[PDB]
Amino acid sequence: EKTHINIVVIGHVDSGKSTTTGHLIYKCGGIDKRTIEKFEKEAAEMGKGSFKYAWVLDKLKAERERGITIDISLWKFETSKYYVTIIDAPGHRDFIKNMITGTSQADCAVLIVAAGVGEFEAGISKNGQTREHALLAYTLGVKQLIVGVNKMDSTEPPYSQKRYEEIVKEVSTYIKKIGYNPDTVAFVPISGWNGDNMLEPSANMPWFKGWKVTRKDGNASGTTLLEALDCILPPTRPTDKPLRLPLQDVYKIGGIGTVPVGRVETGVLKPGMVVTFAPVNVTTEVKSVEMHHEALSEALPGDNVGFNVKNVSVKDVRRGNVAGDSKNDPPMEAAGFTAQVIILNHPGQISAGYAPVLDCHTAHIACKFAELKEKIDRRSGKKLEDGPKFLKSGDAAIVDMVPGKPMCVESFSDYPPLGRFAVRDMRQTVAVGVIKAVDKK
Amino acid sequence: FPMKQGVLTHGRVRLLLSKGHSCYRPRRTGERKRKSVRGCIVDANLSVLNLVIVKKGEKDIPGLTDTTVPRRLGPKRASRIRKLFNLSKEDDVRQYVVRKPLNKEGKKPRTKAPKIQR
Amino acid sequence: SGAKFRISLGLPVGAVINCADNTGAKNLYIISVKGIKGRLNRLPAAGVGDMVMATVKKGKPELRKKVHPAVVIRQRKSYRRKDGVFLYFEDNAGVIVNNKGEMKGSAITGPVAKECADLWPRIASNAGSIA
RNA sequence: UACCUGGUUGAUCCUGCCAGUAGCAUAUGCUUGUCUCAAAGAUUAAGCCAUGCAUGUCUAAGUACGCACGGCCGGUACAGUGAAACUGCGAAUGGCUCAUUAAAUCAGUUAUGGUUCCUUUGGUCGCUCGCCACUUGGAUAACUGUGGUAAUUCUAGA
RNA sequence: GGUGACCACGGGUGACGGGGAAUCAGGGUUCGAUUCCGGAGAGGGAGCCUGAGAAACGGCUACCACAUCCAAGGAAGGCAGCA
RNA sequence: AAUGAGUCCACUUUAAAUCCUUUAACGAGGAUCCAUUGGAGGGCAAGUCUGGUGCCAGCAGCCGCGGUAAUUCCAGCUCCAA
RNA sequence: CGUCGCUACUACCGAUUGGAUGGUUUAGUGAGGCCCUCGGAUCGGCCCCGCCGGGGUGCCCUGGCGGAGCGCUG
RNA sequence: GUCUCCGUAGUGUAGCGGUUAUCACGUUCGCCUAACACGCGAAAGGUCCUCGGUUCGAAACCGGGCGGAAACACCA
Ligand SMILES: [Mg+2]
Ligand SMILES: [Mg+2]
Ligand SMILES: [Mg+2]
Ligand SMILES: [Mg+2]
Ligand SMILES: [Mg+2]
Ligand SMILES: [Mg+2]
Ligand SMILES: [Mg+2]
Ligand SMILES: [Mg+2]
Ligand SMILES: [Mg+2]
């Protein structure tokens, strides 16, 4: 055998991300009936009954009390074609750094779109996140995604054809501008809470014939979301490149010590081989490797793996570092790096010096412009002007960067998933950039 | 939880079970372990009930009173075969033992007899 | 949903009840009961499942000279449970919570009345047994 | 290697301490090419522990009708190799740590004519007058079958 | 009655005892958790079966403190052994 | 001219390896294949050198040095001890 | 040389029938094991003996159903 | 992770949606003295932690993010 991929569910708040994910898990042999029965018992006890499927991933007390997805959670379910682990995005502007973290370690994306009256329009708006999630998925490097339309029973009248066609049209008209091809993007009308059109073809909505995709590699046409999950093309895994591990989270488990967990971007991880962490510059030897309560001898790229490094505390290595092989070339601190940012939506003028938060791979650290070298056209790296005084939305530019807090970044040519980054300010997306050059220490 | 004879209650109790009482085999010599046992009085709250027919009825129960399975292996003691075959004293005791005929496909057929004792 | 029926209160203002959680407090001195409008000369009284304002008289010194929200979990006064059952407990006991209902502590010693368990889910989770 | 030196005063003899000086024993800093030995979670927490292992055992010489193999030499209780299990022995040694403990432990000395002792070794085992002995009775393992519990090195009935 | 200024009794110990170690004119002063001998303990106490030998804890029973699984009816714990 | 420290075949060692000792073949002229740690007023071996600082920064176990010509600080050079 | 005034630091007294953490114990309650005195859920033997039976010759050598002697026993 | 509060000259830190100011110093600083010291004179000194929104314009009205300062949770 089985191949490993990663999927992230992105969408709007209250559009049904965690409930849909939990019910997809339950239908695909995730957890037995009585565990979810106890979950529903608890959900009825406090009051939030419809959030019972959301509880399979939203395990924290604060998330369960507020009924709000705060942090990224993992769960595994084996499908017809291959293994898959799902990234549950929060879906809030308050925790946008969290979903940037989550979206980075995912190969595909499921764009959950609400269909009920009012919720869809509120999602697609200046304060909405359905624009933001799709834009940042394209920014961080997720090529193939799928758009799923949820809450078919909520809309009036239930299971409407006109509603679904309008949703598909309105999603397509903007996803063309973002970059994804709706001909390659599969559109699936689903209902997670009811459990409609997910594992078996529906009976409440016979009007839906079936989605189709037109890719170069292979053409697919399924009826349910599971058939769409299987038809996702396998990613190109760069196994020969030197190993890199953007760190997701740190845990201190009783008796096995501190186990960093992160996605394998390049290289292969194996027990008994010394690793270095770029930002804190600490050397340590790997004891063992596992994944989803199962051990591994070889950790292939694009795998969420948990490995036990020896004699490093929980505080020394924290969220956002990059791990790598000590024998091969290591990730080193980036005192400065020349980045190619394209300004998307910034009201005020851009001068050299304002400090937005720049998120490279998993972590988020603000950085300051030192000087703007060249004003560059919107594509192809075509030079337009030398040394611009200020920058404005709707333009690309090569820029040299000096982070305030220490950070490690890698070029887009050496490791393509490392090179992707986004820029955030004004509580919005201000620029999209990739790194081409970087200075080490 | 199995039931134990002599508990004289309905429900479950905890008993310090020694060697050879019931519901317990000792791991090491002299070990006694406290265990939960159901009382001897039977009521509604049971999974199974063991019942052993003492006297035959008027007709035959299907699948129970038919196709009498034999006891596997005969008596091994010399006196225990003398009782079973009414031997007086040393009358072909060697050849009056029960011989077990075993047959398997690849096996070349053979009879089996026990090492008779005493 | 379902609302709590009326029960015999038997714990007026000034009653000292046991503190059944592991907060380090030994008793709770009830100073008022939540949701009591009142009546001339009538003492505000509480039954099981009632939120009260209480001060601990003996216990850890960092809890003593303060006012805490508490919930009564056991009472000695007999009360009817709508099925002809008159139930009473060995002692009057309550636990310290906040205004949102979750306990300051993490464990409860002894049983918890079913009325309190049904009305406060966070108390019911830490309840060892429900009577 | 039985050793001193600087500092109270304008200067001098003292008292006297401070400081210097050398070793070892813990930690730490910097540095480190070879080779032989070699300590190593004692000091604080005898604080808490995931996981895995650390105590099992058969000779000709107690009990084999498991086919689980197999010589049969073919008219025979048991050839033999042997799983499992019963029985016997071991598991009270070793290893770890130093919390408790101030005539207590412990060291040397002496006694048990005031005691027990698996095993080994050596004695003793016709010393007793008193209708199976050419060998007595019953049960239970392993084994077959029917199960119960979410679960255990849990077990029941036949 | 018995014991005490020939220091009882009580308290402290950052006390396991000893063989020994450091220092080294002689005399001494400190250190001995640590591989050999003896003792004690197995999270804290307590009580027992078996056995020649245990108040055993890689045996059991109960309480206390921690703490594992659970379908919440129960079940299972003891690294001051090697890692 | 002579050698190792290293690369490295084989033997040997060993339960099996490793290491040591043997032994092929490469392996040194800044032999750049680079010795460090603390000091240079006294105690206490070693500079009344030069450039900065100016009772500041700092040094200094103790006496003490530093307030614009520092044998004592920060450095270069040169010396001292192991 | 001392008071007084300012600034630090260190201890002391001090209402608060102060507070916290250990240790040893009185008293009350008291799990569990062990011992004794009972107890008797069950499991076996003898008396079996309603009988067919019976051989040294109704007088049984007993090869079994069966009641149960409704006692004596372990 | 989740909440609660604090975060303005170098400190002391008032504040007002039309103004971050002053104060005590600390320093600088003419000012003496060989040097002190003693006085004498003046000054500087603020992104209101920080970035935003609101707003005719806000440190402060609102929100974030960052630190601290408290809890509360956090077991492949
Ligand atoms: Mg025999
Ligand atoms: Mg009145
Ligand atoms: Mg014996
Ligand atoms: Mg001690
Ligand atoms: Mg010792
Ligand atoms: Mg010893
Ligand atoms: Mg012991
Ligand atoms: Mg014990
Ligand atoms: Mg010098």
From Swiss-Prot, chain A:
Modified residues (N6-succinyllysine): K389
Region (G2): 67-71
Modified residues (N6-acetyllysine): K162, K169, K270, K389, K436
Cell compartments where the protein resides: Cytoplasm; Nucleus; Nucleus, Nucleolus; Cell membrane
Xref: CDD domains: EF1_alpha (cd01883), EF1_alpha_II (cd03693), EF1_alpha_III (cd03705)
Residue positions where N6,N6,N6-trimethyllysine is found in the record: K33, K76, K162, K315
Alphabetical GO biological process terms: cellular response to epidermal growth factor stimulus; positive regulation by host of viral genome replication; regulation of chaperone-mediated autophagy; translation; translational elongation
Region (G4): 150-153
Record carries keyword Transferase: no
InterPro entries, per database record: EFTu-like_2, G_TR_CS, GTP-eEF1A_C, P-loop_NTPase, T_Tr_GTP-bd_dom, TRAFAC_GTPase_members, Transl_B-barrel_sf, Transl_elong_EF1A/Init_IF2_C
GO molecular function, one term: translation elongation factor activity
Catalytic activity line of the entry: GTP + H2O = GDP + phosphate + H(+)
This protein's GO CC annotations: cortical actin cytoskeleton; cytoplasm; cytoplasmic side of lysosomal membrane; cytosol; cytosolic ribosome; eukaryotic translation elongation factor 1 complex; extracellular exosome; extracellular region
Coiled-coil regions, chain positions: none
Function noted in UniProt: Translation elongation factor that catalyzes the GTP-dependent binding of aminoacyl-tRNA (aa-tRNA) to the A-site of ribosomes during the elongation phase of protein synthesis. Base pairing between the mRNA codon and the aa-tRNA anticodon promotes GTP hydrolysis, releasing the aa-tRNA from EEF1A1 and allowing its accommodation into the ribosome. The growing protein chain is subsequently transferred from the P-site peptidyl tRNA to the A-site aa-tRNA, extending it by one amino acid through ribosome-catalyzed peptide bond formation.
PANTHER family found in the cross-reference section: TRANSLATION FACTOR
Protein name per the record: Elongation factor 1-alpha 1
Organism expressing this protein natively: Homo sapiens (Human)
Gene label: EEF1A1
UniProtKB/Swiss-Prot annotation, chain B:
Domain of life: Eukaryota
Residue list for modification (3R)-3-hydroxyarginine: R77
Signal peptide from the UniProt entry: none
Cellular localization per UniProt: Cytoplasm; Nucleus, Nucleolus
Residues modified as Phosphoserine: S88
Processing and modification events after translation: Ribosomal protein S6 is the major substrate of protein kinases in eukaryote ribosomes. The phosphorylation is stimulated by growth factors, tumor promoting agents, and mitogens. It is dephosphorylated at growth arrest.
Subunit structure, interactors included: Component of the small ribosomal subunit. Part of the small subunit (SSU) processome, composed of more than 70 proteins and the RNA chaperone small nucleolar RNA (snoRNA) U3.
Function recorded in the entry: Component of the 40S small ribosomal subunit. Plays an important role in controlling cell growth and proliferation through the selective translation of particular classes of mRNA. Part of the small subunit (SSU) processome, first precursor of the small eukaryotic ribosomal subunit.
Family: Belongs to the eukaryotic ribosomal protein eS6 family.
The protein's name in its UniProt record: Small ribosomal subunit protein eS6
Protein source organism: Homo sapiens
Lineage: Eukaryota, Metazoa, Chordata, Craniata, Vertebrata
Residues of the full protein shown: 61 to 178 of 249
Swiss-Prot record, chain C:
Pfam family membership, one: Ribosomal_L14
CDD domains with a match to the protein in the record: Ribosomal_uL14
Phosphoprotein recorded as keyword: yes
Main localisation: cytoplasm
Residues modified to Phosphoserine: S8
Top-level taxon of the source organism: Eukaryota
Keywords: Cytoplasm, Phosphoprotein, Ribonucleoprotein, Ribosomal protein
GO BP terms in the entry: cellular response to actinomycin D; cytoplasmic translation; G1 to G0 transition; negative regulation of transcription by RNA polymerase II; negative regulation of ubiquitin protein ligase activity; negative regulation of ubiquitin-dependent protein catabolic process; positive regulation of cell population proliferation; positive regulation of gene expression
UniProt keyword annotation of DNA-binding present: no
Gene Ontology MF terms: large ribosomal subunit rRNA binding; RNA binding; structural constituent of ribosome; transcription coactivator binding; ubiquitin ligase inhibitor activity; ubiquitin protein ligase binding
GO cellular component: cytoplasm; cytosol; cytosolic large ribosomal subunit; cytosolic ribosome; extracellular exosome; focal adhesion; membrane; nucleolus
NCBIfam families: PRK08571.1
Summary of the function given for this chain in its UniProt record: Component of the large ribosomal subunit. The ribosome is a large ribonucleoprotein complex responsible for the synthesis of proteins in the cell.
Family as reported in the entry's similarity comment: Belongs to the universal ribosomal protein uL14 family.
Subunit structure, interactors included: Component of the large ribosomal subunit.
Protein name: Large ribosomal subunit protein uL14
Organism this protein belongs to: Homo sapiens (Human)
Gene name linked to the record: RPL23
